[PDB]
């Protein structure tokens, strides 16, 4: 669970003809102290055959995933970064196992030093199991 927070802002000046006539204006911001996120994705070959999505495009996609956040800095954005990436590759045009079984091999839990509120990646432990014979696991990406 996450607990959103809100803060207040002053202002030098006035945009409009505010002739009522210090600190002249309020403002708000919304933030998250800390949080860790997960996502899932798929790729299908039969559809790819219909458009031509090829290998070089796949490599460019991997690179985009690795380096997504670096060019995104903004006022409100805060600090964000990516941590892990695991890829499962079946050995034929139609997979060799159900998807849900694969996603279950990845597990996330608290480190030993739980210490109440989490505030860093260090607070967590990540582990990956071993895949069936027909699936190839590469995680070093």
């Amino acid at each position: 669970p996450v607990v959103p927070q809100e803060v207040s802002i002053t202002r030098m000046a006035v945009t409009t003809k505010a002739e009522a006539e210090d600190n002249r204006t309020m403002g708000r911001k919304h933030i998250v102290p800390y949080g860790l996120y997960v996502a899932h994705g798929f790729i299908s070959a039969p559809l790819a055959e219909k458009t031509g999505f090829s290998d070089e495009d796949l490599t460019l996609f991997w690179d985009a995933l690795v380096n997504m956040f670096e060019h995104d800095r903004s006022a409100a954005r805060g600090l964000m970064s990516s941590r892990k990436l695991i890829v499962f590759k079946h050995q034929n045009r139609l997979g060799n196992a159900p998807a849900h079984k694969l996603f279950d091999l990845v597990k996330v839990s608290r480190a030993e030093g739980s210490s109440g509120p989490a505030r860093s990646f260090a607070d967590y432990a990540v582990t990956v199991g071993q895949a069936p014979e027909g699936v190839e696991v590469k995680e070093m990406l």
């Binding site: 669970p1 607990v3 959103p4 809100e6 309020m26 708000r28």
Partner: protein
């Protein structure tokens, strides 16, 4: 007011608490942007156990702000806070869609009662 001061239903109590908090805050800081309701209504319902303890911090600060002044209502609120909370054994983790509805009811009844002279 239709408020029943002896219901003792946990969500009802919670809603009353909420309303009183709101009123206190309102009194503390005239000319505010918005209400407590606006900011934290959702969250409260979602996760009562995580937010109430933060709300009670600000409550204290508001009360402090107030009491120093001749408008020593704010002592009267604190007594209500005492009474309400008294009846509660622990905060819930989660609330059903049903008690969420109940929660609302309590809020409203208390709200009108406060606004009475």
């Amino acid at each position: 007011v239709s408020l029943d001061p002896a219901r003792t239903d946990r969500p009802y109590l919670l809603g009353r608490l909420f309303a009183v908090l709101e009123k206190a805050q309102e009194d503390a800081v005239p000319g505010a942007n918005a209400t407590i309701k606006d900011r934290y209504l959702a969250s409260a319902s979602a996760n009562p156990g995580q937010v109430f303890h933060m709300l009670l911090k600000n409550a204290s600060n508001h009360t402090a702000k107030l009491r120093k002044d001749p408008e020593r209502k704010a002592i009267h609120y604190e007594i209500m806070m005492q009474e309400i909370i008294d009846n509660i054994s622990d905060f819930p983790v989660t609330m059903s869609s049903d008690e969420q509805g109940l929660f609302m009811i309590g809020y409203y009844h208390q709200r009108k009662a406060l606004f009475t002279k």
